[PDB]
Design a protein around this ligand. Structure first.
Ligand SMILES: CC1=C(/C=C/C(C)=C/C=C/C(C)=C/C=C/C=C(C)/C=C/C=C(C)/C=C/C2=C(C)C(=O)CCC2(C)C)C(C)(C)CCC1=O
Length: 313
């Protein structure tokens, strides 16, 4: 019989970029000031080649009050507020931050980065030198492909703050209207004509989450890169609406195999673009589907791949 935990094992020879969670683990060991300085350095150097897209208007409005609070602080208090976030200390600011969706957290830091560059928010101390462990962490990051680099940064950002309780309030950007069916493009996948997989891709590309979720079984799950499975339609739909808007999925090739009891397992490789970087960063991605006899999604995993040589053939 199939369980979510066991389905995690399909296509086991897929080599995921586990250097990413490895690096985040090392990063999380560092002193808070080194964490902030390390990301500042990474951000400035990346900025020479890649431009981050501007945060959406709604996002900025939601982070506005927190941002102004920090801006009104004296420089030492500003540095303390940022250290609190990095240390995951329990403060009202850290609790507010923890209630934000990833995009709102990212836009928050986007704006603080501008202000630090402009000198209106306490910057990293001049001539600051990273610790021994911190220097090696940054070196690892700069050795990564851009897709892995931005994933490390995002995970660092999402990890900050303080979560008290599970059913604490959740704040996310408004859900965008699905793309009008007329202007929708359709993907083509070498080797794969499976309607569920193609509909999965096309609806996500159209931000049509209501149609997308109907592809799943009631107890079905979605496993984002380096995260635990998100289980059930309620939780998966929430994830779509809060975190999966305006993606571009560009699947390339796949393979289709039988599984136990009339199930089918399908692996697809290709690229994904995040709206934070548009076409300037193409992440190498595998999708691993487990479909039931009716073609419903019992499980789909999304893996960030170790390197372009992990793409099928
Ligand atoms: C923090 C910080 C700073 C600021 C730093 C800043 C501003 C950093 C900002 C960094 C940014 C903007 C990072 C964004 C990354 C986005 C990624 C990895 C998205 C991937 C999505 C994927 C793979 C989607 C996959 C998907 C597909 C395909 C599905 O099929 C299902 C959906 C799913 C979602 C799973 C300063 C510079 C000020 C220094 C101080 C300091 O600490």
């Amino acid at each position: 019989p199939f369980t979510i935990d066991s389905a995690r094992g399909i296509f086991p020879n897929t080599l995921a970029a586990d250097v990413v969670p490895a690096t985040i683990a090392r990063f999380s060991q560092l002193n808070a000031e080194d964490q902030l300085a390390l990301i500042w350095f990474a951000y400035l150097e990346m900025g020479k080649t890649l431009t981050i897209a501007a945060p959406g208007a709604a996002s900025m409005q939601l982070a506005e009050n927190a941002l102004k609070e920090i801006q009104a602080m004296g420089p030492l208090q500003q540095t303390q507020a940022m250290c609190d976030l990095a240390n995951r200390a329990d403060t009202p600011l850290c609790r507010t931050y923890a209630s934000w969706s990833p995009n709102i957290k990212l836009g928050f830091w986007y704006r603080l980065g501008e202000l630090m560059e402009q000198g209106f928010v306490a910057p990293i101390p001049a001539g600051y030198q990273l610790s021994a462990n911190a220097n090696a962490v940054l070196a690892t990051i700069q050795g990564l492909e851009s897709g892995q680099q931005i994933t490390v940064l995002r995970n660092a950002v999402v990890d900050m703050g303080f979560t008290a309780g599970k059913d604490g309030k959740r704040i996310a950007e408004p859900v965008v209207p699905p793309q009008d069916t007329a202007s929708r493009t359709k993907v083509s996948i070498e080797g794969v004509t499976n309607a569920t997989v193609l509909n999965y891709m096309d609806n996500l590309n159209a931000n049509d989450f209501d149609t997308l979720i109907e592809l799943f079984t009631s107890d079905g799950a979605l496993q984002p890169p380096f995260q635990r499975p998100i289980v059930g339609k309620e939780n998966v739909l929430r994830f779509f609406r809060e975190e999966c808007q305006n993606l571009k999925l560009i699947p390339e090739r796949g393979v289709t195999e039988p599984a136990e009891d009339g199930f089918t397992q399908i692996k697809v490789t290709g690229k994904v673009q995040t709206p934070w970087f548009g076409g300037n960063v193409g992440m190498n991605i595998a999708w691993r589907f487990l479909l039931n006899p009716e073609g419903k999604i019992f499980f789909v995993a999304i893996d960030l791949l170790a390197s372009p040589k992990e793409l099928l053939n």
